[PDB]
């Protein structure tokens, strides 16, 4: 095992809302990437009933399914 | 005090021609430094056009030419639209949390936003290490809760190079 390990839950419990934006992201090249207001991890927001259908039956794209 | 990561990781971004930028964003060494970046990054599902996020260990460049990748490969899952963002999150949380159990064989992960699909991949150092590639495969299934009969593909980077006799289809 590795010296530093973190399960999924522990990783999440260590999230803290922080409105500070790292300077690196204020770079002009990453305008399309910049998210000013901090977003919490998606793990905490519940799945939509549509999001549930896909994740439980088939997640593959049409494109890959056509190569079988 | 912050919780260190086994390795330092570096975020990279690229926007293909609709011209791989692959410019690096920043590097982080703890779980807190990670959330500071990721919380202020647009979800891949919201990116327009042909964009990529790369999350690689510090020192590994998101390219097969890198010394850690030239003999490596990547597991690949091609997803329908609307799932990359959560899978991408689960994938990197496992990687940063050292949940894969293959030593130093992991190199990084990629999420690629495309037209009618998204592709997420996880790269490793030596493709002939079947013990490692098989273990990464099963870990991918569990961390992403893949339903049964999901399609995945392992590609060796060297086999992705175009060269005479292997140029793929081309116009005339």
UniProtKB/Swiss-Prot annotation, chain A:
Origin superkingdom: Eukaryota
UniProt domain comment: The GYF domain interacts with GRB10.
Function statement: May act cooperatively with GRB10 to regulate tyrosine kinase receptor signaling. May increase IGF1 receptor phosphorylation under IGF1 stimulation as well as phosphorylation of IRS1 and SHC1.
Protein family per UniProt: Belongs to the GIGYF family.
Oligomeric form and interacting partners: Interacts with GRB10. This transient binding is increased under IGF1 stimulation and leads to recruitment of GIGYF1/GRB10 complex to IGF1 receptor. Interacts with DDX6.
Protein name: GRB10-interacting GYF protein 1
Native source organism of the sequence: Homo sapiens
Gene name of this polypeptide: GIGYF1
Full-protein residues shown: 36 to 103 of 1035
Curated annotation (Swiss-Prot), chain B:
UniProt effect for mutating residue 12 to A: Unable to bind capped mRNA
Region (EIF4EBP1/2/3 binding): 3-6, 35-39, 90-97
Record-listed cross-link Glycyl lysine isopeptide (Lys-Gly) (interchain with G-Cter in ISG15), residues: 74, 162
Record annotation: effect of changing residue 65 to A: Ability to bind capped mRNA reduced to less than 10% of wild-type
Biological process per Gene Ontology, one example term: negative regulation of translational initiation
GO molecular function: mRNA cap binding; RNA 7-methylguanosine cap binding; RNA binding; RNA cap binding; translation factor activity, RNA binding; translation initiation factor activity; ubiquitin protein ligase binding
Chief localisation class: cytoplasm
Function: Recognizes and binds the 7-methylguanosine-containing mRNA cap during an early step in the initiation. Acts as a repressor of translation initiation. In contrast to EIF4E, it is unable to bind eIF4G (EIF4G1, EIF4G2 or EIF4G3), suggesting that it acts by competing with EIF4E and block assembly of eIF4F at the cap. In P-bodies, component of a complex that promotes miRNA-mediated translational repression. Involved in virus-induced host response by mediating miRNA MIR34A-induced translational silencing which controls IFNB1 production by a negative feedback mechanism. Component of the 4EHP-GYF2 complex, a multiprotein complex that acts as a repressor of translation initiation. In association with GIGYF2, assists ribosome-associated quality control (RQC) by sequestering the mRNA cap, blocking ribosome initiation and decreasing the translational load on problematic messages. Part of a pathway that works in parallel to RQC-mediated degradation of the stalled nascent polypeptide.
Quaternary state and interactors: Interacts with EIF4EBP1, EIF4EBP2 and EIF4EBP3. Does not interact with eIF4G (EIF4G1, EIF4G2 or EIF4G3). Component of the 4EHP-GYF2 complex, at least composed of EIF4E2, GIGYF2 and ZNF598. Interacts with GIGYF2 (via the 4EHP-binding motif); the interaction is direct. Interacts with EIF4ENIF1/4E-T (via YXXXXLphi motif); increasing affinity for the 7-methylguanosine-containing mRNA cap.
Protein name: Eukaryotic translation initiation factor 4E type 2
Lineage of producing organism: Eukaryota, Metazoa, Chordata, Craniata, Vertebrata
Gene: EIF4E2
């Amino acid at each position: 095992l590795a010296d530093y390990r973190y399960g999924r839950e522990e990783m999440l419990a260590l999230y803290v809302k922080e409105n500070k934006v790292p300077e690196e992201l204020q770079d002009k090249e990453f305008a399309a990437v910049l998210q000013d207001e901090p977003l919490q991890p998606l793990a905490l927001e519940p799945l939509t009933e549509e999001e549930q259908r896909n994740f439980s039956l088939s997640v593959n794209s049409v494109a890959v399914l056509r190569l079988m | 005090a912050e919780h260190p990561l086994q390795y330092n990781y570096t975020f990279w971004y690229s926007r293909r021609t609709p011209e791989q930028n692959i410019k690096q964003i920043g590097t982080f060494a703890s779980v807190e430094q990670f959330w500071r970046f990721y919380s202020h990054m647009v979800r891949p599902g919201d990116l327009t056009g042909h964009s990529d996020f790369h999350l690689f260990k510090e020192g590994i460049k998101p390219m097969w030419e890198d010394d850690a990748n030239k003999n490596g490969g990547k597991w690949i899952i091609r997803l329908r639209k609307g799932l990359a963002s959560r899978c991408w999150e689960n994938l990197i949380l496992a990687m940063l949390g050292e949940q894969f159990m293959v030593g130093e064989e992991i190199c990084g992960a990629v999420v690629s936003v495309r037209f009618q699909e998204d592709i997420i991949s996880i790269w490793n150092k030596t493709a002939s290490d079947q013990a490692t590639t098989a273990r990464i495969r099963d870990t991918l299934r569990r961390v992403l809760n893949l339903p049964p009969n999901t399609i995945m593909e392992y590609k060796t980077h060297t086999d992705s190079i175009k060269m005479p006799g292997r140029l793929g289809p081309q116009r005339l």
